[PDB]
């Protein structure tokens, strides 16, 4: 599923991040990062692909031995301290449909603009479904990739939940 | 006695008042946190009186 090139590049990034967790100080990290890069540049032009796979397998054995047990994680990355922190504030847009008319009256401009989007959605849907029928082989999709819109006035099929998703900082 | 026991209970009753006002009797949402903080600061003052009486004579009840 991952190519050999993808596995080497993933390992390089993963190795560099753990090395930074060890070094901490920027000047120390710069020094050892360049040494690490030189270890990858050494075997950059290995054309024997059985040898190349051996190099990667040993490299991953080396990484597992030398990894930081508590590596740095970006706060909003999976496993970080702010990951999913703001999910409780994300409210799906269909909830506005159930607002009482007195609540909707507080935002007359916002709700008129929302109706235009809902109209754009309704009038586009049939062409989206048709575009997907025409472009999907007999067996059905073989991958998850979705196409662009091909004409003028068409919207890319299945766009609503991407375009109107909650803001990352919704409140 | 009567000041000591009354003020020690006032400290507790004062802290519950912002919780009771959540029933909307006289509720100012605009700055509820300031309201809660003020009650804590006033409860601290009211509790320093029975503490001072204890430090003075060792009054306990």
């Amino acid at each position: 599923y991952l190519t050999h090139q993808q596995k080497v590049l993933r390992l390089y990034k993963r190795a560099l991040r753990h090395l930074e967790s060890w070094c901490i100080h920027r000047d120390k990290y710069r020094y050892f990062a360049c040494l690490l890069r030189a270890r990858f540049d050494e075997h950059k032009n290995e054309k024997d692909m059985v040898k190349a796979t051996q190099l990667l397998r040993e490299a991953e054995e080396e990484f597992w031995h030398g990894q930081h047990p508590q590596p740095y994680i970006f706060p909003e990355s999976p496993g970080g301290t702010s990951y999913e922190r703001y999910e409780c504030y994300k409210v799906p847009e269909w909830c506005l449909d159930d607002w009482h008319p007195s609540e909707k009256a507080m935002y007359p401009d916002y709700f008129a603009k929302r109706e235009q989007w809902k109209k754009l959605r309704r009038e586009s849907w049939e062409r989206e479904v048709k575009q997907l029928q025409e472009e999907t082989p007999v067996g059905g999709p073989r991958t998850e990739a979705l196409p662009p819109a091909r004409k003028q006035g068409d919207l890319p099929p299945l766009w609503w939940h991407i375009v109107t998703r909650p803001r990352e900082r919704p409140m | 006695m009567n000041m000591f026991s009354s003020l020690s209970l006032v400290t507790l009753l004062l802290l519950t008042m912002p919780i009771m006002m959540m029933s909307f009797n006289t509720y100012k949402p605009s700055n509820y946190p300031l309201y809660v903080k003020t009650a804590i600061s006033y409860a601290f003052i009211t509790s320093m009186i029975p503490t001072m009486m204890f430090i003075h004579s060792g009054q306990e009840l």
Partner: protein, 155 residues
């Protein structure tokens, strides 16, 4: 949902295995039922015993909090493997080594506390002395009975 879409009895012939794999949205090569006992799994697939925490957090799951896609067969013990419960993720230290180091540490400390009790630290002084027969009446002793005198002397 029809009966033919619901879990059935354990698959007996290879043509029932193919039907079961199709019912559960699996390749028949991957499909594999639980061992035929009285346990009561029927033909429900036996899937890898891994936590949902091990799934790719960046993939666009239909259920991101559970890391499940709509329509994929769910592990029999999914409710045990949600991210709030049992984690099976690889550890930076081997499971067996961790157990030795933790057990070794607790056992060593418990042994040392036993040693510390048998050879306690103390200071080079005699007993603390108290007046009025070691405070016989203050400690609640019987006023009517006469305690056996305790006498302390100057040194």
């Amino acid at each position: 949902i029809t009966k033919d879409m619901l879990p059935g009895p354990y698959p007996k012939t290879p043509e029932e295995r193919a039907a079961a794999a199709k019912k559960y949205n699996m390749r028949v090569e991957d499909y594999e039922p639980y061992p035929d006992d009285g346990t009561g799994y029927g033909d429900y697939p036996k899937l890898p015993d891994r936590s949902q925490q091990e799934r790719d957090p960046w993939y666009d799951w239909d259920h991101p909090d559970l890391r499940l896609n709509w329509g994929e067969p769910m592990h029999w013990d999914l409710d045990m493997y949600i991210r709030n419960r049992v984690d099976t993720s690889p550890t930076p230290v081997n499971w067996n080594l961790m157990c030795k180091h933790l057990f070794g540490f607790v056992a060593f400390m418990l042994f040392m506390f036993w040693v510390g009790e048998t050879y306690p630290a103390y200071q080079p002084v005699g007993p603390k002395q108290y007046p009025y027969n070691n405070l016989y009446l203050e400690r609640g002793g019987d006023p009517n009975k006469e305690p056996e005198p305790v006498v302390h002397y100057e040194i």
